[PDB]
Amino acid sequence: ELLPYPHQLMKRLLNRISMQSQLIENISMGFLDNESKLPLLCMETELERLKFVIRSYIRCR
Amino acid sequence: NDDDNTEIIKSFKNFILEFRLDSQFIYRDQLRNNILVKNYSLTVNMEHLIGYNEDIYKKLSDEPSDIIPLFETAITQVAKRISILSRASLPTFQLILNSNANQIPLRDLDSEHVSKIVRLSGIIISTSVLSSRATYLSIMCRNCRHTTSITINNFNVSLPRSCLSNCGPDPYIIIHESSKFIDQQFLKLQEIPELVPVGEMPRNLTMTCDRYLTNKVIPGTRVTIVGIYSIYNSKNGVAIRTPYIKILGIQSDVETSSIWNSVTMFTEEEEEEFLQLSRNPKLYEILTNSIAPSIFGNEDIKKAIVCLLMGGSKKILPDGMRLRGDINVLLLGDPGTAKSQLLKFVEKVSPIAVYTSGKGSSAAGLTASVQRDPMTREFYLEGGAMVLADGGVVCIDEFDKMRDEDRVAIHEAMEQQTISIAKAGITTVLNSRTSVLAAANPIYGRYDDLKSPGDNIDFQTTILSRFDMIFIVKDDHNEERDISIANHVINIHTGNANAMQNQQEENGSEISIEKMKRYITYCRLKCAPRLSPQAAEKLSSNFVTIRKQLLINELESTERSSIPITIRQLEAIIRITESLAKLELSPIAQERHVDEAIRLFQASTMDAASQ
Amino acid sequence: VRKDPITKEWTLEGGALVLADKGVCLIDEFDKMNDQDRTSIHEAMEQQSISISKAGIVTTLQARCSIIAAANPNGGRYNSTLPLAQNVSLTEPILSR
Amino acid sequence: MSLPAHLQQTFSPEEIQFIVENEPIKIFPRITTRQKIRHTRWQLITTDDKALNNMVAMRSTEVVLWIALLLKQQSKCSIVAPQWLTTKELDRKIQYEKTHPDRFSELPWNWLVLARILFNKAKDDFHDPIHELRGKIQDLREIRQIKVLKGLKYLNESHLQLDNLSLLEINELRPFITEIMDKLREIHTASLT
Amino acid sequence: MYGDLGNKLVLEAKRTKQLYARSNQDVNLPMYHEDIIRNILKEVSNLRKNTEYLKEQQQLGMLDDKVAKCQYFVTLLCMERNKRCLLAYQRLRTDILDSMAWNNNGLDTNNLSHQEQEYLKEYCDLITDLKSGDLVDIDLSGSLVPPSDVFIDVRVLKDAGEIQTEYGVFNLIKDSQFFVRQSDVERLIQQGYLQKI
Amino acid sequence: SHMASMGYYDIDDVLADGTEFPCKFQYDIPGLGYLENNPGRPITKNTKLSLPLWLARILAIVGPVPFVELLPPDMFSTKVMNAIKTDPVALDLHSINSHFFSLAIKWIMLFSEKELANVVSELLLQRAQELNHHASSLSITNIATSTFLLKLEEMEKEIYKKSHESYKDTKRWMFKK
Amino acid sequence: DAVFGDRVRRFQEFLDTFTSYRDSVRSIQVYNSNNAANYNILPHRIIISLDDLREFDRSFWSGILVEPAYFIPPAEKALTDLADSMDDVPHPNASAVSSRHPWKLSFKGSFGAHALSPRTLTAQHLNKLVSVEGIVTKTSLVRPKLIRSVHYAAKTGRFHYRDYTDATTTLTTRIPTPAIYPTEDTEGNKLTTEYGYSTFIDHQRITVQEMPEMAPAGQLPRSIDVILDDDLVDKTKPGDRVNVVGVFKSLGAGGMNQSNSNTLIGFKTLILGNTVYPLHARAARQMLTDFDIRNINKLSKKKDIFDILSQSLAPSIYGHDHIKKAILLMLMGGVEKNLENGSHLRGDINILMVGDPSTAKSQLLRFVLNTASLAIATTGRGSSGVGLTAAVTTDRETGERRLEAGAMVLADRGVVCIDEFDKMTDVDRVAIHEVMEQQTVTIAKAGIHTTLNARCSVIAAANPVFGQYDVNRDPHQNIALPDSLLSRFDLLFVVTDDINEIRDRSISEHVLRTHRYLPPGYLEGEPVRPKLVTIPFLRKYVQYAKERVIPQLTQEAINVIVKNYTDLRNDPITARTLETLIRLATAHAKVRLSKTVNKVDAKVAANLLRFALLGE
Numbered sequence A: 001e002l003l004p005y006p007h008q009l010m011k012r013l014l015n016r017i018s019m020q021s022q023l024i025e026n027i028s029m030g031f032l033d034n035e036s037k038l039p040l041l042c043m044e045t046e047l048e049r050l051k052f053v054i055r056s057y058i059r060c061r
Numbered sequence B: 001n002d003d004d005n006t007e008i009i010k011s012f013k014n015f016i017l018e019f020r021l022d023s024q025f026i027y028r029d030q031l032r033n034n035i036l037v038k039n040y041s042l043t044v045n046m047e048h049l050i051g052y053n054e055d056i057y058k059k060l061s062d063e064p065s066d067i068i069p070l071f072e073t074a075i076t077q078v079a080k081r082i083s084i085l086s087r088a089s090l091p092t093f094q095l096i097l098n099s100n101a102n103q104i105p106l107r108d109l110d111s112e113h114v115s116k117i118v119r120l121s122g123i124i125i126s127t128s129v130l131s132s133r134a135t136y137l138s139i140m141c142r143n144c145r146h147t148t149s150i151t152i153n154n155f156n157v158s159l160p161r162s163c164l165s166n167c168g169p170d171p172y173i174i175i176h177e178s179s180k181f182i183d184q185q186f187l188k189l190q191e192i193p194e195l196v197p198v199g200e201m202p203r204n205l206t207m208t209c210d211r212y213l214t215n216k217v218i219p220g221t222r223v224t225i226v227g228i229y230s231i232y233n234s235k236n237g238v239a240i241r242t243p244y245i246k247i248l249g250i251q252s253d254v255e256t257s258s259i260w261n262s263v264t265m266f267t268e269e270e271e272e273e274f275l276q277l278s279r280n281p282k283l284y285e286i287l288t289n290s291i292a293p294s295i296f297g298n299e300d301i302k303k304a305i306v307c308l309l310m311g312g313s314k315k316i317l318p319d320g321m322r323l324r325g326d327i328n329v330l331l332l333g334d335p336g337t338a339k340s341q342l343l344k345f346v347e348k349v350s351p352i353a354v355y356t357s358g359k360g361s362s363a364a365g366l367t368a369s370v371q372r373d374p375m376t377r378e379f380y381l382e383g384g385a386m387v388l389a390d391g392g393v394v395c396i397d398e399f400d401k402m403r404d405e406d407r408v409a410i411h412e413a414m415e416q417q418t419i420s421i422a423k424a425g426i427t428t429v430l431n432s433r434t435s436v437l438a439a440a441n442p443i444y445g446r447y448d449d450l451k452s453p454g455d456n457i458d459f460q461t462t463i464l465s466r467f468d469m470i471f472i473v474k475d476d477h478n479e480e481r482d483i484s485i486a487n488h489v490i491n492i493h494t495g496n497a498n499a500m501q502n503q504q505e506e507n508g509s510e511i512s513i514e515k516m517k518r519y520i521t522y523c524r525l526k527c528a529p530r531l532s533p534q535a536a537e538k539l540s541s542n543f544v545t546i547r548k549q550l551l552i553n554e555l556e557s558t559e560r561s562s563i564p565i566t567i568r569q570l571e572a573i574i575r576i577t578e579s580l581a582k583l584e585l586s587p588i589a590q591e592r593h594v595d596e597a598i599r600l601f602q603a604s605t606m607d608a609a610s611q
Numbered sequence C: 001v002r003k004d005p006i007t008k009e010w011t012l013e014g015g016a017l018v019l020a021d022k023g024v025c026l027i028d029e030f031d032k033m034n035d036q037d038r039t040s041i042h043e044a045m046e047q048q049s050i051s052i053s054k055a056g057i058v059t060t061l062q063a064r065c066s067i068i069a070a071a072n073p074n075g076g077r078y079n080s081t082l083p084l085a086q087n088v089s090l091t092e093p094i095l096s097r
Numbered sequence D: 001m002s003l004p005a006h007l008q009q010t011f012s013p014e015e016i017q018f019i020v021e022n023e024p025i026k027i028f029p030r031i032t033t034r035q036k037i038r039h040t041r042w043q044l045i046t047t048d049d050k051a052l053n054n055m056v057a058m059r060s061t062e063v064v065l066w067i068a069l070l071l072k073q074q075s076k077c078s079i080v081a082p083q084w085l086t087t088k089e090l091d092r093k094i095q096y097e098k099t100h101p102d103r104f105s106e107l108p109w110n111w112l113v114l115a116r117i118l119f120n121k122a123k124d125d126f127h128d129p130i131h132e133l134r135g136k137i138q139d140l141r142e143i144r145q146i147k148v149l150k151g152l153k154y155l156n157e158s159h160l161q162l163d164n165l166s167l168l169e170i171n172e173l174r175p176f177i178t179e180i181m182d183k184l185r186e187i188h189t190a191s192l193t
Numbered sequence E: 001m002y003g004d005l006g007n008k009l010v011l012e013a014k015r016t017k018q019l020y021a022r023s024n025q026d027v028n029l030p031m032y033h034e035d036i037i038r039n040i041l042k043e044v045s046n047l048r049k050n051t052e053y054l055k056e057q058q059q060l061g062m063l064d065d066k067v068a069k070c071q072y073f074v075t076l077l078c079m080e081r082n083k084r085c086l087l088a089y090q091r092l093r094t095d096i097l098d099s100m101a102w103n104n105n106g107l108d109t110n111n112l113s114h115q116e117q118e119y120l121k122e123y124c125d126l127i128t129d130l131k132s133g134d135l136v137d138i139d140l141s142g143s144l145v146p147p148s149d150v151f152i153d154v155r156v157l158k159d160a161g162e163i164q165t166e167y168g169v170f171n172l173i174k175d176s177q178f179f180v181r182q183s184d185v186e187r188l189i190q191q192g193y194l195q196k197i
Numbered sequence F: 001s002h003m004a005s006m007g008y009y010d011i012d013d014v015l016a017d018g019t020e021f022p023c024k025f026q027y028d029i030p031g032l033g034y035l036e037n038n039p040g041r042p043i044t045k046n047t048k049l050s051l052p053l054w055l056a057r058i059l060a061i062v063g064p065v066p067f068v069e070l071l072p073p074d075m076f077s078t079k080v081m082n083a084i085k086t087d088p089v090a091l092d093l094h095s096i097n098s099h100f101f102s103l104a105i106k107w108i109m110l111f112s113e114k115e116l117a118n119v120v121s122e123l124l125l126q127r128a129q130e131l132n133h134h135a136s137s138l139s140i141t142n143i144a145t146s147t148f149l150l151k152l153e154e155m156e157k158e159i160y161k162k163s164h165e166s167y168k169d170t171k172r173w174m175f176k177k
Numbered sequence G: 001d002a003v004f005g006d007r008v009r010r011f012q013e014f015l016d017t018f019t020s021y022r023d024s025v026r027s028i029q030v031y032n033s034n035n036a037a038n039y040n041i042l043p044h045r046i047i048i049s050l051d052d053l054r055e056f057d058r059s060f061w062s063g064i065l066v067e068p069a070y071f072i073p074p075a076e077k078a079l080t081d082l083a084d085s086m087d088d089v090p091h092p093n094a095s096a097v098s099s100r101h102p103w104k105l106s107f108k109g110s111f112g113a114h115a116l117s118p119r120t121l122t123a124q125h126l127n128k129l130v131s132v133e134g135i136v137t138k139t140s141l142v143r144p145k146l147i148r149s150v151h152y153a154a155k156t157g158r159f160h161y162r163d164y165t166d167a168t169t170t171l172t173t174r175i176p177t178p179a180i181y182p183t184e185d186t187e188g189n190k191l192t193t194e195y196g197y198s199t200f201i202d203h204q205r206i207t208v209q210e211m212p213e214m215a216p217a218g219q220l221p222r223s224i225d226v227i228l229d230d231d232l233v234d235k236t237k238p239g240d241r242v243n244v245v246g247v248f249k250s251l252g253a254g255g256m257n258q259s260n261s262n263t264l265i266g267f268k269t270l271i272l273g274n275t276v277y278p279l280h281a282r283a284a285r286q287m288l289t290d291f292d293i294r295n296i297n298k299l300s301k302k303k304d305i306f307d308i309l310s311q312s313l314a315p316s317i318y319g320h321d322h323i324k325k326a327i328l329l330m331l332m333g334g335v336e337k338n339l340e341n342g343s344h345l346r347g348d349i350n351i352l353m354v355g356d357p358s359t360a361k362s363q364l365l366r367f368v369l370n371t372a373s374l375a376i377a378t379t380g381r382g383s384s385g386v387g388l389t390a391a392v393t394t395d396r397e398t399g400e401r402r403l404e405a406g407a408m409v410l411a412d413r414g415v416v417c418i419d420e421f422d423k424m425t426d427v428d429r430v431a432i433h434e435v436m437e438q439q440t441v442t443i444a445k446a447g448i449h450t451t452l453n454a455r456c457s458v459i460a461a462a463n464p465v466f467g468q469y470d471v472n473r474d475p476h477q478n479i480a481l482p483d484s485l486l487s488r489f490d491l492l493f494v495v496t497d498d499i500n501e502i503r504d505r506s507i508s509e510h511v512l513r514t515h516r517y518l519p520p521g522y523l524e525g526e527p528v529r530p531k532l533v534t535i536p537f538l539r540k541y542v543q544y545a546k547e548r549v550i551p552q553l554t555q556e557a558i559n560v561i562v563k564n565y566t567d568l569r570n571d572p573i574t575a576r577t578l579e580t581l582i583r584l585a586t587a588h589a590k591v592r593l594s595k596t597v598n599k600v601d602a603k604v605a606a607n608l609l610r611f612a613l614l615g616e
């Protein structure tokens, strides 16, 4: 079956991807001026892992 | 001694269960994959056995006949552990060996090798029927009626001389109902022609294989064997006994398929190379230049040899009428024109072929001969060159020097694709579906181009009509062509052409013998193309023009033509039209194939008749 | 091909172009051979092999000889006003070998 | 269509890896990120951020497996294998499997997937010698494959029960079990009036 | 009889279904059977002429209660069958064009009928309308292989010189190697400029 | 009536519906002689035609006495039922009909047959055991596999291709990244 | 003891359930009681359906197939104990009471993986019930095998007996009884052997060879030796295509005996035959239903039939309507007259096609070879005069001088297809005269002096001596053969491939349609693995027209035959040619399904002969 769409869940996640992707860019402006880079690497690879689940979800439906 | 065998067995169970490269337990996985498809065997590569524990390879190679049957039981014990639930049967597994030990030339086998694992190679000249060896005798006493059994392993045991518990001196009979048996086959292997010493006849071994190695070869195949060089006490000198090989691993060199009902033995890593190659827009240029790359010119003869290697398509009507799919070609011509060098090439590219000389041949040696077996004293039938070449090409060189009684035996095997026999109370029609490629000279050696074109040619219209393309290969003395040949031939002797043929293969302008042999073998199994309805409108409008042309040429010449056009030659142009569609793996034949098939027929049989 | 009197199945016996393999075969009075005998040489001149298919034996022997032949012209004497192809009873496929 | 044919009704093994990488795993950090009372910070949105900003070298902690593998790719972590990846606990499960033909043992849903990930990425972090662990993971893989082949003799129009089968062991069988039970159902419902 | 042209169209449909799944790449779908389809559409027109030529002959009196009850119904069933073969063939070729439009043109035109050259354009325009909107933050035409991989070594397989991409600049010198974040190079890997992973 | 699991656009259902079944006509009918390959004649009662299943399935239902009887087809004759019941694994169904299972389901719908539904449910379940062995067995093909895939229907080839790629992709993932 | 006695009651319950086996036993028992005792005799054998047995007890059925030496013996005991419960007869004779004549089983249908051929039969099949399909060769001579000796003890009046055991008599192994009669009793009385109360069974060994059509590429046909006994003996002859069911079994010690040192030889293996079914389609005859009979009779009324049937011969070959007409009359051959004073007159039409290359001479021989009920192919180079006639041999079972049949003897009451007929050696053509004149061959070699029947019709093909027919030369210049041998043929057709724009277009379109054929169920490009009749109906029509009709020559046809004979002869025609006219007229009367040769048959015979003579 085509299951019913998670309306409020999807609006929430598409906010957090927009806010988090702005945050990763803002933190990359501090690096122009400790200064350890693992949390930047994790915040970026988490958005790739999350954007994949939503793309794979929408492409499926 | 059985403490010692139990340690040898335990050490090989642990080879199967522990041997790993990368993440994968390659012998546990191979056992399970073989159990599911139900072949109870394991192939072991001996570099891995040396890599695990060299003491085991030492034990194995010191006395194979006593250690191979201990590794077979170690395989069965693992086979139970990995495929049956304990505390909730399989036969004795075969061990098959692969090796890269140095090949011993077949004539260098001597007393130094008795009982050793020996790797070698040769041409299979014969295969026997299958025979049954026991692996388990059920047993009962004649007198007291005690009952037991004997497990048998077939290296280098017999019925016991004592009742085991007066009961008598030879007490036991075999209960056939409860006994179990295995297949055994005898081969004979001749040595490779390029390894025979000067002036000697090629030497021969008999050898035996059993279980999953039986039926894995056919006469004429070139093979490498791993086996135990060993001895048997034949009744056929003093203190003397006959050598043979217990075969432990046949390995056919080119994946020549053996006894094979067209089954899908190819692998996706080569099938996807062929399925790209089919779709190359230049494919017919590539295959034409890959035929005999050291032979200059002869472009149409190469184009026709490519058609002959594919053949057309075989058909079977609701009438029951069978149509020939195989293409036959005649190279009739002047001396030193590469006719025999092209026959010696088609013998190597074709997946099955036989080269023969018509002067070195007989009717019986070509077709099938009645032999008398010295033991039964019965007659039996043996296949000649046409039966050995079945499903392939027979190359008949010196076809003009064949006797008139011998050439006629070929007439059935070129059209109806059978060899009929009625001799010594044998009667059969044997199947023999081959292309014939033949080479000949005219009467008077050269073509003598001023003389009547029928007075140059010896052959009757009965045999000439059985050839789909006849090439009258004239040599013409044009100085620009002779310089173009002279430069080319010198580049062969001086070793330049070797590097050019390597560079053209790397450039993709040419393909190797091994690749081409496997491409031909694939096209014969994936395509049998039909004519499109529009291809018939062209081939009909053409063939009636070819007959009008012939009738006019006969009216000038005041006689029946010696090279004929007949309806067997319409079917030649149809069959060529299909061969060109098999090259590119087309499911159908089209107006572009019909144009090239009419062109090749014009450049061969019709320009040969026009002389 | 020989048939044994005892085991009485077929085998190969090698001729002069096998017994001279990596060597020479010397053919005296080559013009006076029968044409049926003389034309057996055509494979062993160029391909340096002997391809038999007789009595269910189908195989190829090696035959890498040099052949030296001696002959007389037609009529027993050379006649210097004629072309070679008229001085000799041979033909282009064997003369070119 | 929008979704490739080989994904239309099942997961790829790489998607079954991606699902298993979302689980918590215990680690020993080789970095102290914890700030003293007497700097960049993680700020994640799919997992608990409060575990990573509080690492202290060699005191164990739990993190999501895809972060443990990303830290272990540098020298910056070591991955503590679960208790069931011990030669004792694997050998109790092998004994259970042999003892109960009728059932699969209570291995966790991800056991093949997690064994394959950690034997490649965390090969040095096992207390037992990894060649005996690979050996027993294979011993378990093979016994469960026999029990699966016994189970397929019972394909049915109504249902099956497959209690402790792994996600990777379900995912190889899915396009066979469901495709055959679908044709057994079509042949059955066709017979009904 | 009339369905026998339809069966040849669907045997070509089946062969292109096999072709496109067996071969590992995106193959170019084979050329549209404009001729077989014109034969089928011509036969449907003759079945229409037979419905007209029957429907009048009912009033002229030729035992229509039996005769038309069967003849109309069989003529109609032949046209249902020809519609199904044409639609089954045209839907399969549609499924492959949508697969191209996501897989490749999301990031051979001689073979397509003019309606399919048009449809493929309108469907590529629909794909870009979905990703150009809300849901823009995720590149819907992007990869369905999960991001198990963070940085990757990539070997540059064809020369392409200095090129821009949204995230940065690379000089794609033949047989140089980069170690770079997978998310930056993934579209260049798909275009086949890069090798590894 | 039609069942939703076999689709309109489903090519192997379009092809299955194309296969001919033997049919006896129960009426005289003018104009329909094109079914007998002669348009000029009428159809005559007790003519024994072979009609495609997409025509025969519908003519068997309407006319009570309908236009056609379906005669029992060769592929569901007692000979084939006996061969199915002795050795399901050895049987060469691809020679009996390339679409045998799709056609079996259509025949079991068209006449409710608990008897044929049992025989075909068993044939499927027994051949499915071998389909799993040949799909599971991965080389590091054999004759003993290739001799079975040649005995194999256009329905069971989908299940084989799909199951084999499922085992193969799992091996491909376990034994390299 | 224990499991045998259960399997007996388990099979007894099957025979009680499927009552058609009691009915079959009853039918045999009353027929033998009528013809032997009350007044040609039926065997004590029952063919069971293996499908009835599968559905009654799958565990007995799988025992019969996989362990037959443990399940056929108790099943034959159960059937024998049934027949003895049914049997009633007053005052039975001593040979009946002494007979050792139990009931034997035979099997139908559905062997599954146990259906095999001589090549696929393998050591994994030993001790299993198998069906094998092949061509029969080398049938050995029949010999009586001793299985019980009865003895009479003079000075006591007791009849003793002994039973005998051999590895081919029984499915289970027994200690082999040494073939020596008791000479003296247990007590010491002299024993006399009672032949006629003693029991012997007929025994024969046959070789079944793989069908050459099925043999894989470049491999020669394999074979199995089959043992046949009691009532299966002579149910086959060499050249029969056959399906044999039997237990595949091993024999001997196989070199496990210290009398031999070889260690490479294997056990001997045989099939003990339980039943034999003959075949001829590529099933030895068509059984004809009341519907087949209705169709054959109704079709014979249509005046066009001689065209309908002859066009339905070889429909892929274009033209040659007059040769295909002569082939139809050769198949429905004329009537033989066994006249007194040795005056036997042949019924059999002989056809020689001599002609240009590529005219379907060989493709019409290969049609005759397919459609005829018995046909033997030969070719001129492939045939010895020995292998055409009969060859001397030793029968390896018995050590004795024997004849093997040649192609002209195997083809008795059938057709011989001799291709390449002009390529036969002069010594081999001597053998063809005897068959064509005297329908027999005479053997005088090895101390065998005999006459064999060879009552066959020769169809033959040849080319003229110059490879195409030279119209500037006589028939006796063009055709290689002695005019004596040419007089033994009825219809010497001469055929040419002559250029004509309309005919060459017409045959060209026909072969291009013929090459476009797609066999049903194959895909495009996949490799192979107003009136006409289908060939399986034409085979039924020909069989009916030979088993049902024997036309009588009649004055209406005589008034035509002598009119046309005297016209032909008064402007090569000889006394033999009058008998050809009578054969063609008698053959055509069979095509019309009629008991009398009418004026129409004599006219069609004269036109068809005048075509072959004049090339009309």
Ligand SMILES: Nc1ncnc2c1ncn2[C@@H]1O[C@H](COP(=O)(O)OP(=O)(O)NP(=O)(O)O)[C@@H](O)[C@H]1O
Residues within 6 Å of the ligand: B294, B295, B296, B297, B333, B334, B335, B336, B337, B338, B339, B340, B341, B342, B439, B440, B441, B485, B489, C046, C047, C093
């Ligand atoms: N066109 C060519 N290109 C290259 N080599 C050639 C060519 N023509 C002849 N030769 C060489 O010259 C020799 C020709 O001998 P061969 O190929 O046996 O001639 P042939 O045509 O069979 N003549 P023949 O046996 O006399 O009728 C071989 O060594 C060839 O390689």
Ligand SMILES: Nc1ncnc2c1ncn2[C@@H]1O[C@H](COP(=O)(O)OP(=O)(O)NP(=O)(O)O)[C@@H](O)[C@H]1O
Residues within 6 Å of the ligand: B323, B324, B415, B416, B462, B465, B567, B568, B571, G316, G317, G318, G319, G356, G357, G358, G359, G360, G361, G362, G363, G364, G461, G462, G463, G507, G511
């Ligand atoms: N009239 C024809 N109609 C159709 N095919 C024909 C016809 N005549 C000959 N052929 C084809 O020509 C080919 C040769 O026929 P075949 O019977 O082998 O020739 P043949 O007359 O016996 N000639 P030959 O063997 O040389 O003496 C076969 O493929 C035939 O089907």
Ligand SMILES: [Mg+2]
Residues within 6 Å of the ligand: B339, B340, B341, C046
């Ligand atoms: Mg040469």
Ligand SMILES: [Mg+2]
Residues within 6 Å of the ligand: B415, G358, G360, G361, G362, G363
């Ligand atoms: Mg012929």
Ligand SMILES: [Zn+2]
Residues within 6 Å of the ligand: B141, B142, B143, B144, B145, B146, B163, B167, B171
């Ligand atoms: Zn004893």
